[PDB]
Amino acid sequence: QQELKQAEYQLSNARNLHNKLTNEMEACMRAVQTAMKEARDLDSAPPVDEYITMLETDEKELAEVETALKLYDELKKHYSTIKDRALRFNKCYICDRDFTNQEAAKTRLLEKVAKRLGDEEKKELLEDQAAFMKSLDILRAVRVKYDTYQRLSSELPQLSREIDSETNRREDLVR
Amino acid sequence: QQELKQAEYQLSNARNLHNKLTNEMEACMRAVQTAMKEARDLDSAPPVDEYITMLETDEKELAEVETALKLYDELKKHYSTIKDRALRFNKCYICDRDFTNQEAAKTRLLEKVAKRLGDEEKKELLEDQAAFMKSLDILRAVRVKYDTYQRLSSELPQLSREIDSETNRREDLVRRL
Amino acid sequence: QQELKQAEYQLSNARNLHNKLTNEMEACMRAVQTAMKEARDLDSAPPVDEYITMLETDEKELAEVETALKLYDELKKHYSTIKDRALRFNKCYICDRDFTNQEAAKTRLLEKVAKRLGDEEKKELLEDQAAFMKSLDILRAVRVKYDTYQRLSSELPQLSREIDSETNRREDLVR
Amino acid sequence: QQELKQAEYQLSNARNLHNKLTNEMEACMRAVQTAMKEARDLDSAPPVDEYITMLETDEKELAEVETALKLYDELKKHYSTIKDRALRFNKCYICDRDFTNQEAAKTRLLEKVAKRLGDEEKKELLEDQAAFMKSLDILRAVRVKYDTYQRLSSELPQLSREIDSETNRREDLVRRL
Ligand SMILES: [Zn+2]
Numbered sequence: 174q175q176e177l178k179q180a181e182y183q184l185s186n187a188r189n190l191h192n193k194l195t196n197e198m199e200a201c202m203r204a205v206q207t208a209m210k211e212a213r214d215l216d217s218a219p220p221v222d223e224y225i226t227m228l229e230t231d232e233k234e235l236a237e238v239e240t241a242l243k244l245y246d247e248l249k250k251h252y253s254t255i256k257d258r259a260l261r262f263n264k265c266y267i268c269d270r271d272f273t274n275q276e277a278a279k280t281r282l283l284e285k286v287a288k289r290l291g292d293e294e295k296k297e298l299l300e301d302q303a304a305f306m307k308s309l310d311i312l313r314a315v316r317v318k319y320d321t322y323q324r325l326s327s328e329l330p331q332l333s334r335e336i337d338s339e340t341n342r343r344e345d346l347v348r
Numbered sequence: 349q350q351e352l353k354q355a356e357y358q359l360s361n362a363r364n365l366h367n368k369l370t371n372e373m374e375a376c377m378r379a380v381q382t383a384m385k386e387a388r389d390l391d392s393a394p395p396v397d398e399y400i401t402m403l404e405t406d407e408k409e410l411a412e413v414e415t416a417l418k419l420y421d422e423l424k425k426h427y428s429t430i431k432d433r434a435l436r437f438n439k440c441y442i443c444d445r446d447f448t449n450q451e452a453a454k455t456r457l458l459e460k461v462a463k464r465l466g467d468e469e470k471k472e473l474l475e476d477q478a479a480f481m482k483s484l485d486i487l488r489a490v491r492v493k494y495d496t497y498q499r500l501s502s503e504l505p506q507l508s509r510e511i512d513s514e515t516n517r518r519e520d521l522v523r524r525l
Numbered sequence: 526q527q528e529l530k531q532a533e534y535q536l537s538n539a540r541n542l543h544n545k546l547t548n549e550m551e552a553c554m555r556a557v558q559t560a561m562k563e564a565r566d567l568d569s570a571p572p573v574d575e576y577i578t579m580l581e582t583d584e585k586e587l588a589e590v591e592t593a594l595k596l597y598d599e600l601k602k603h604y605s606t607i608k609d610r611a612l613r614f615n616k617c618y619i620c621d622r623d624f625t626n627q628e629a630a631k632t633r634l635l636e637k638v639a640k641r642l643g644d645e646e647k648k649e650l651l652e653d654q655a656a657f658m659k660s661l662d663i664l665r666a667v668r669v670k671y672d673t674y675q676r677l678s679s680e681l682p683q684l685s686r687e688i689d690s691e692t693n694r695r696e697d698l699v700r
Numbered sequence: 701q702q703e704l705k706q707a708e709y710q711l712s713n714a715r716n717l718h719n720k721l722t723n724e725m726e727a728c729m730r731a732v733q734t735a736m737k738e739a740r741d742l743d744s745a746p747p748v749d750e751y752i753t754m755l756e757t758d759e760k761e762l763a764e765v766e767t768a769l770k771l772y773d774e775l776k777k778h779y780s781t782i783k784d785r786a787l788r789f790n791k792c793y794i795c796d797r798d799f800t801n802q803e804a805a806k807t808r809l810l811e812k813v814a815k816r817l818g819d820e821e822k823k824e825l826l827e828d829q830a831a832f833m834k835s836l837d838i839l840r841a842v843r844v845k846y847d848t849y850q851r852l853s854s855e856l857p858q859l860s861r862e863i864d865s866e867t868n869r870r871e872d873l874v875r876r877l
């Protein structure tokens with residue numbers, strides 16, 4: 174008799190805890206699926222297990238375009254010193270030979286370096302940086318909801334074992 | 349009085365949980381503090397909430413040396429094509445003028461590109477990439493322990509206020525009875 | 526008269542040189558006026574000595590937009606670290622207070638920094654840097670021609686006076 | 701032979717002009733070499749054609765410290781508005797939350813911002829701006845001398861060929877006697 178009230182109370186606490194934890198897990202899954210759907214502009218939401226890959230892709234695809242942005246800048250520094258020493262000082266930067274009576278060789282150099290540094294590349298990979306940064310921010314915002322979804326996926330079966338064991342304890346304890 | 353028995357049972361469970369959760373936050377705190385001490389080889393462990401600044405520091409200091417390595421490679425490609433067109437084809441790559449009877453200017457070019465080349469910059473950037481990646485991995489390993497320490501820092505005051513309220517009810521009600 | 530032959534000889538050389546140098550000055554003037562017309566996209570070419578003021582105009586208008594580009598990037602780092610901590614770590618970066626039960630204050634922070642992260646300004650002042658660099662290169666290309674025009678404007682009067690002195694010499698030396 | 705004496709007269713003028721223009725080139729070279737020595741306080745004068753790298757490096761080292769000064773001022777403006785909203789209105793500028801019953805968090809904000817507000821960095825950037833502008837002005841003062849030395853290095857060999865032709869032809873015209 175006396176401990177059956179504890180067995181019933183424990184089982185009731187564990188049932189209600191499992192229900193509440195399940196609801197929170199489902200909410201986190203919805204939120205993370207909504208983020209995955211909008212982050213890449215998907216027509217239907219992917220499986221929750223795909224968030225880790227979508228986040229790693231974004232973390233890398235952003236780092237790639239940011240390396241490429243500094244790459245363009247450092248190359249454009251070098252090509253500008255080539256053009257400047259030709260225009261300002263009548264000279265090829267690499268071999269330090271002047272262009273006196275050699276205006277065609279100077280013209281060829283300038284027409285070459287002008288084709289090394291168009292602006293449309295910078296426009297495009299700045300648009301890429303903007304899109305990958307937006308997408309990564311959307312996935313970073315739900316990181317803690319995926320992590321709670323993950324730990325609740327380990328905690329709910331452990332609690333369910335406790336519920337089933339206490340259910341059998343109750344079913345025995347009647348006599 | 350079954351309602352007082354429930355009130356004492358409800359406070360028991362709460363006090364015991366605040367104990368279990370306090371022990372878990374404190375373990376999380378010791379784990380993240382030792383990881384912070386280890387990651388930067390510190391003489392004593394920093395405050396628990398310096399974790400975010402040194403994680404963000406390692407994330408960006410690693411990204412910097414990885415951009416610098418990729419930059420060095422691209423510059424080394426370009427300078428190699430300059431050296432190669434001078435050695436293989438007797439030409440300056442930029443202006444398309446040969447070095448026939450100009451061996452001193454060819455020599456100059458080659459000595460210049462040889463100074464825009466060198467092992468030490470890649471060697472020491474690779475050591476820095478290895479060091480920041482080690483430090484970042486040590487801090488990333490405890491990310492989940494920092495996040496639970498933080499969530500428990502919200503939950504313990506809420507649970508503590510709930511106990512205080514329950515304790516007051518237990519006091520007021522045992523006086524009534 | 527041997528020295529009258531020598532006089533008519535050097536007077537003639539000076540006269541022909543004054544012509545040659547006059548034609549070189551005029552060729553330089555037309556080149557720098559053409560550069561000034563195309564550099565700022567003018568309906569008519571300006572006076573030759575407007576060159577130095579519009580050159581140092583382009584030098585400083587370029588330096589301004591390049592400082593503003595570097596400024597925008599540094600500000601965008603600060604605003605991004607503020608956004609990042611709010612999204613990733615649920616804290617305000619400045620005061621180190623979390624947003625638990627305060628998601629309206631978190632939302633206010635994120636909306637405020639988003640209004641500090643627009644790329645229209647970068648798009649526009651990258652067009653400005655491209656435009657001022659083009660005009661500065663056009664004006665830099667003719668710098669040496671302008672400097673020759675300037676030195677010949679000192680030399681031609683000096684030589685002109687020489688001719689006239691040798692003309693008086695010749696006119697005196699006939700008898 | 702009047703045509704031979706006209707050829708001797710032409711040769712004499714070219715020879716004397718080459719001498720005059722050579723003396724002018726050497727005067728230009730000396731001036732730019734002493735200016736390069738002065739601009740960076742060098743203990744021996746560099747080769748005349750290093751003038752372009754010295755001018756380009758002075759232009760960019762000046763321009764970057766002038767950008768750094770503008771950077772520091774805009775950062776100091778932003779940090780001043782953070783300090784001011786905390787001191788004057790008891791509030792965090794970023795999140796719009798007051799510091800009532802939170803004066804430790806207010807104190808942390810103010811101490812963090814005080815560690816950004818360092819005036820020594822402006823002193824050092826102004827010292828560097830002063831030094832690079834002095835250096836650049838020394839090199840800009842000799843710009844016209846270097847551009848002169850450069851045009852004369854094209855003209856003297858052309859005139860030297862003309863001499864070598866006329867010195868051959870004079871000797872041919874006395875062989876013709
Ligand atoms: Zn070349």
Ligand SMILES: [Zn+2]
Pocket residue numbers: 617618619620621622792793794795796797
């Ligand atoms: Zn705040």
